[PDB]
Structure 1
Amino acid sequence: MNQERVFKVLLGPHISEKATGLADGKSQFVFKVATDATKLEIKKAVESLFSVKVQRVTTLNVKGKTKRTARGLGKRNDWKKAYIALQPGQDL
């Protein structure tokens, strides 16, 4: 990242029960990221934005669900999730 790509990397926080439990207990925050966002681009984006210090980023790709309904077998988009751990003081 060396451009306006910083604004196209993080798609938004993930609002699961596992996400909030991770935010409270540990200092990890689950974000939705672009499917072609590397772990380095996510770390830089969360540091430029949100003005925090990132300790480690782990990512995983999530398969979109199919839901064969209503004259055919549809399919939701594949999406990427990032677990972002900061320093203990920071809360993002």
Structure 2
Amino acid sequence: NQERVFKVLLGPHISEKATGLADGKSQFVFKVATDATKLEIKKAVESLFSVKVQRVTTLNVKGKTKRTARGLGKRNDWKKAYIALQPGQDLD
């Protein structure tokens, strides 16, 4: 569809592991929609960044429960994906 391409990638994930992966390997870490599959997020990166991805690996991250006077509040859950590019191309 025309949509479902500007809704699967929620933005880059800045970290120390993600930064090291981008330099050592050609893997980039992204925050993806919780209902996004591996096919959608590989056809979205190649369309919105003009690159070629060999494969993508995804995981679901649970939200940390923070205790405050009023009850226990759960932070929003989210999905993470390691976009592994070809030896060429960079996901900037």
SS of 1:61 mapped into structure 2: strand
Q: Show CA shifts across 1:21-65 (max 9, x none).
A: 000000000000000000000000001011100111000000000
Aligned alpha-carbon RMSD (Å): 0.7
**1:3: how far off?**
1.9
Q: Show CA shifts across 1:63-92 (max 9, x none).
A: 000011132100101100000000111111
Distance in 2 of aligned mates of 1:53 and 1:69: 46
Distance in 2 of aligned mates of 1:70 and 1:35: 30
Sequence identity (%):
100
Distance in 1 of aligned mates of 2:69 and 2:89: 47
Any gaps of 5 or more consecutive residues in structure 2? none
Any gaps of 5 or more consecutive residues in structure 1? none
SS of 1:6 mapped into structure 2: coil
Distance in 1 of aligned mates of 2:63 and 2:2: 29
**How many residues are matched?**
91
Structure showing the higher helix proportion among its residues: 1
Distance in 2 of aligned mates of 1:54 and 1:10: 15
Runs of 4+ that moved beyond 3 A: none
**TM-score w.r.t. structure 2 length?**
0.96
**1:4: how far off?**
1.2
